[PDB]
Amino acid sequence: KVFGRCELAAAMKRHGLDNYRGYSLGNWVCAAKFESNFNTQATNRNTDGSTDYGILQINSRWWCNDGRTPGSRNLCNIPCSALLSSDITASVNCAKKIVSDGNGMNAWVAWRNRCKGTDVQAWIRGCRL
Ligand SMILES: [Au+]
Ligand SMILES: [Au+]
Ligand SMILES: [Au+]
Secondary structure (H helix, E strand, O other): OEOOHHHHHHHHHHOOOOOEOOEOHHHHHHHHHHHHOOEOOOEEEOOOOOEEEOOOOEEOOOOOEOOOOOOOOOOOOOEHHHHHOOOOHHHHHHHHHHHOOOOHHHHOHHHHHHHOOOOHHHHHOOOOO
16 A cells, blocks of 8 residues: 555654654654655665565564575564555554664664754645644
8 A cells, every 4th residue: 555645744743653652643653754765665685684674664674574584583473574564553553563673763764864853844845643
């Protein structure tokens, strides 16, 4: 599913991400924009052999099981395919664990490089939330 911007904002807000770990909703929408282009089915293989999955590009080395990432963990207790659903519940639940792990949203490299420090409220402009 390719979300619209305000459609994703509403869903993320419903699931309690607005200002989870102190990160405003616009941070999460901006992260999703540059991680996945709002596409729940996005996948991208990394040089280390892990893969990133779904709207927030959650990685198979620590967080989900894809069966092909040696030496990895599955700390979200989910198959990585659950992160590709049109229903973002599993991605949000896992994102909450990740953002709690110590480095906040710096765990998302596109957030650090493209969203951090920017006018992230622009990402929720015009949305009725
Ligand atoms: Au879909
Ligand atoms: Au929820
Ligand atoms: Au949902």
